[PDB]
UniProtKB/Swiss-Prot annotation:
<keyword id="KW-0479">Metal-binding</keyword>
<dbReference type="GO" id="GO:0009046">
    <property type="term" value="F:zinc D-Ala-D-Ala carboxypeptidase activity"/>
</dbReference>
<keyword id="KW-0482">Metalloprotease</keyword>
<comment type="function">
    <text>This enzyme catalyzes carboxypeptidation and transpeptidation reactions involved in bacterial cell wall metabolism. It effectively catalyzes the transfer of the N-alpha, N-epsilon-diacetyl-L-lysyl-D-alanyl electrophilic group of the standard tripeptide substrate N-alpha,N-epsilon-diacetyl-L-lysyl-D-alanyl-D-alanine to water. It also performs a weak beta-lactamase activity, hydrolyzing penicillin into penicilloate at a very low rate.</text>
</comment>
<dbReference type="GO" id="GO:0071555">
    <property type="term" value="P:cell wall organization"/>
</dbReference>
<dbReference type="GO" id="GO:0046872">
    <property type="term" value="F:metal ion binding"/>
</dbReference>
<protein>
    <recommendedName>
        <fullName>Zinc D-Ala-D-Ala carboxypeptidase</fullName>
        <ecNumber>3.4.17.14</ecNumber>
    </recommendedName>
</protein>
<feature type="binding site">
    <location>
        <position position="138"/>
    </location>
    <ligand>
        <name>substrate</name>
    </ligand>
</feature>
<feature type="disulfide bond">
    <location>
        <begin position="3"/>
        <end position="81"/>
    </location>
</feature>
<keyword id="KW-0862">Zinc</keyword>
<feature type="binding site">
    <location>
        <position position="197"/>
    </location>
    <ligand>
        <name>Zn(2+)</name>
    </ligand>
</feature>
<keyword id="KW-0732">Signal</keyword>
<feature type="modified residue" description="Blocked amino end (Asp)">
    <location>
        <position position="1"/>
    </location>
</feature>
<feature type="active site" description="Proton donor">
    <location>
        <position position="192"/>
    </location>
</feature>
<keyword id="KW-0961">Cell wall biogenesis/degradation</keyword>
<feature type="binding site">
    <location>
        <position position="195"/>
    </location>
    <ligand>
        <name>Zn(2+)</name>
    </ligand>
</feature>
<keyword id="KW-0121">Carboxypeptidase</keyword>
């Protein structure tokens, strides 16, 4: 028993860290073209996300976070709080301290953590096949070494660059639309034919012309 343990049921009207932690876990279920706010307040958007999560794993979908809902999260949660199929190291091929960015190392890792939970949801929705992560966090040095953009969300811990795997670039960019990625760049967008870029953060910008987006 390590990362986090929920003490009791959560429903609309609840507020606190327990709510903030659950929002992270279900951040991959905000509805198409939406983003869940991680504010610690259990409102209607939070109930909807929970319902979607419950449905995705064949639990009773009532939108109430009870003990069965927590037992499923416990099955997807690693010691360090990351989901079972993604790790911090896989999300940072830059350095080992998450320093260098446009925000704190702790803010960078927390932003990363949400991205991991969104990827976990997407991994299951796509059929439980491995999703290849090619890059994630980039300090300012790392970003320049790549010739990245000055504004790049990579330096915030919000983005991940995905390789084709058995899904293909387009399948990944299309599904990303359902999992809280406000920024998606892929095939047909300049410098994005050899990977699919997904990122969280404010402001929606979707472009992958070769994929129909
Ligand atoms: Zn990228």
């Amino acid at each position: 028993d390590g990362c986090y343990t929920w003490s009791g049921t959560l429903s609309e009207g609840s507020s606190g860290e327990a709510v903030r932690q659950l929002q992270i876990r279900v951040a991959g279920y905000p509805g198409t073209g939406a983003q869940l706010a991680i504010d610690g307040q259990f409102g209607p958007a939070t109930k909807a996300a929970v319902q979607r999560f419950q449905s995705a794993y064949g639990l009773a979908a009532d939108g109430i976070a009870g003990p069965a809902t927590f037992n499923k999260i416990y099955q997807l949660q690693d010691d360090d709080c990351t989901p079972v199929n993604f790790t911090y190291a896989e999300l940072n091929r830059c350095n080992s301290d998450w320093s260098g960015g446009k925000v704190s190392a702790a803010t960078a890792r927390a932003n990363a953590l949400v991205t991991m939970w969104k990827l976990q949801a997407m991994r299951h929705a796509m059929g439980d096949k491995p999703i290849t992560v090619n890059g994630g966090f980039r300090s300012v040095t790392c970003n320049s070494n790549v010739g990245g953009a000055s504004n790049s969300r990579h330096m915030y811990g919000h983005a991940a660059d995905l390789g084709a795997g058995s899904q293909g670039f387009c399948a990944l960019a299309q599904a990303a639309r359902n999992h809280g990625f406000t920024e998606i760049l892929g095939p047909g967008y300049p410098g994005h034919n050899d990977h699919t870029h997904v990122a969280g953060g404010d402001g929606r910008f979707w472009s992958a012309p070769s994929c129909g987006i």
